[PDB]
Design a protein around this ligand. Structure first.
Ligand code: HEC
Ligand code: HEC
Length: 226
């Protein structure tokens, strides 16, 4: 692999590319408000692809975008063929954001691509960045939703709510995003898979057993059908 580094915002170029990158950051950070026609729930991309210092997609094991551009096109089993990064983004609009894919030449999509390309600056095409994706966590027993409920009350509820509906900020963006219900990701999202949710929770915060069980509890709840 190659190491994950984040480029310096102060070194963004003047001109069309720089402006595009800045818009791309905003689309990824503030998606429901910036792209209402395409977002069907309360989630922004940053809610599963966090970053520090206002950036999005810069954290190891939380599916960083650093280095993503050089890994596409790639095979997708759901499509049964190679897909582009633009298509992958559309899939997450449809699934994680319970919405509608942007046209493949939509200016907002291109800005998001520009931003991801900026994050990927210096990464060799084809190279894998350390910390890419969300590593799965799989245990050799069923997740215990009863244990998970107790864990949720003790470790998660204060932020994500008794009803999993999250906490809004003063500007109507989710400070703490919804984990289930009509404003959360739909059943088509990767986060709806036990081992992915467990892995995400494990790394973004728990023991392996606790992460496994609390993920199980979270995933017992209704959410929109894809
Ligand atoms: C107790 C173990 C839990 C569980 C099961 C989850 N969380 Fe959180 N969470 C918080 C914030 C600000 C985010 C957005 C991403 C970030 O900036 O770090 C999240 C994100 C999640 C997700 C993915 C998004 C979604 O809506 O599904 C999941 C599955 C998730 N969390 C589960 C904030 C908090 C907290 C405030 C300090 C606490 C405590 C937790 N989360 C605890 C948990
Ligand atoms: C949680 C419900 C998510 C939201 C909201 C978004 N994404 Fe996502 N994304 C998520 C997971 C669990 C994964 C799989 C990680 C892995 O192990 O590969 C992804 C993956 C992507 C990718 C591919 C990353 C890679 O191949 O390394 C891209 C390009 C991506 N996601 C983009 C993206 C955008 C633009 C979003 C807002 C529209 C978005 N995602 C929201 C979980 C979630």
């Amino acid at each position: 692999t190659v190491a994950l580094t984040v480029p310096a915002a102060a070194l963004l170029p003047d001109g069309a590319l720089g402006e595009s990158i800045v818009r791309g950051r905003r689309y990824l950070s503030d998606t429901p408000a910036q792209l209402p026609d395409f977002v069907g729930n309360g989630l922004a991309c940053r809610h599963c692809h966090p970053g520090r210092d206002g950036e999005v997609g810069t954290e190891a094991n939380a599916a960083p975008f650093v280095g993503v551009v050089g890994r596409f096109p790639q095979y997708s089993a759901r499509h049964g063929r190679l897909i582009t990064l633009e298509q992958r983004i559309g899939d997450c609009f449809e699934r994680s954001l319970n919405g509608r894919a942007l046209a493949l030449d939509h200016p907002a999509l291109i800005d998001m691509l520009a931003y991801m390309s900026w994050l990927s600056q210096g990464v060799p095409v084809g190279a894998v960045v350390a910390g890419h994706g969300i590593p799965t966590l799989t245990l050799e027993r069923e997740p215990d939703g009863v244990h998970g409920e107790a864990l949720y009350q003790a470790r998660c509820l204060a932020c994500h709510g008794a009803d999993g509906s999250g906490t809004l900020d003063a500007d109507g963006r989710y400070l703490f995003p919804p984990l289930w219900g009509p404003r959360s990701f739909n059943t088509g999202a990767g986060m709806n898979r036990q081992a992915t949710a467990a892995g995400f929770i494990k790394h973004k915060m728990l023991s392996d057993e606790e992460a496994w069980d609390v993920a199980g509890f979270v995933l017992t709840h209704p959410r929109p059908l894809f």
